[PDB]
Amino acid sequence: SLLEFGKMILEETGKLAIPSYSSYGCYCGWGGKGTPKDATDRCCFVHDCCYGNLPDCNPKSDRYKYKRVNGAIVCEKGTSCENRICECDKAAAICFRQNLNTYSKKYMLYPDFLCKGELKC
Numbered sequence: 211s212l213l214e215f216g217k218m219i220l221e222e223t224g225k226l227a228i229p230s231y232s233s234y235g236c237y238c239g240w241g242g243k244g245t246p247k248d249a250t251d252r253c254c255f256v257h258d259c260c261y262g263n264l265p266d267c268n269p270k271s272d273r274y275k276y277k278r279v280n281g282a283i284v285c286e287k288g289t290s291c292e293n294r295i296c297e298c299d300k301a302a303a304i305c306f307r308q309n310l311n312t313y314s315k316k317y318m319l320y321p322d323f324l325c326k327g328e329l330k331c
């Protein structure tokens with residue numbers, strides 16, 4: 211759920227999910243079109259695709275459990291939807307961590323008309 215996800219992103223990156231990753235670029239936050247602006251934006255694009263692999267799941271609201279093993283995120287057993295949502299979220303948080311060196315505040319609040327298409331999952 212948005213709860214596990216936001217706390218997972220803060221743990222990984224030291225950044226608040228809202229607002230650092232909730233209106234960034236073309237894919238981070240509600241909506242999505244066009245070519246991702248940068249690596250962090252591509253993380254969001256892939257996460258959107260990951261959720262799109264799960265049309266009968268409800269990632270905003272379905273809570274999953276995860277733990278830390280040796281600092282690593284480990285998804286714990288739940289429903290199939292919960293396990294798959296957790297893996298999507300885990301990947302996005304790790305992807306955000308891996309691309310902190312190129313995160314750019316200039317992409318916050320990025321305007322929709324500059325999201326010049328197109329990218330298939």
Ligand SMILES: O=C(O)CCCC[C@H]1[C@H]2NC(=O)N[C@H]2C[S@@]1=O
Binds near residue numbers: 212231239254258
């Ligand atoms: O907005 C947030 O909660 C921070 C995460 C970044 C945006 C991505 C992520 N956030 C979320 O709750 N689901 C997805 C939609 S985007 O891929």
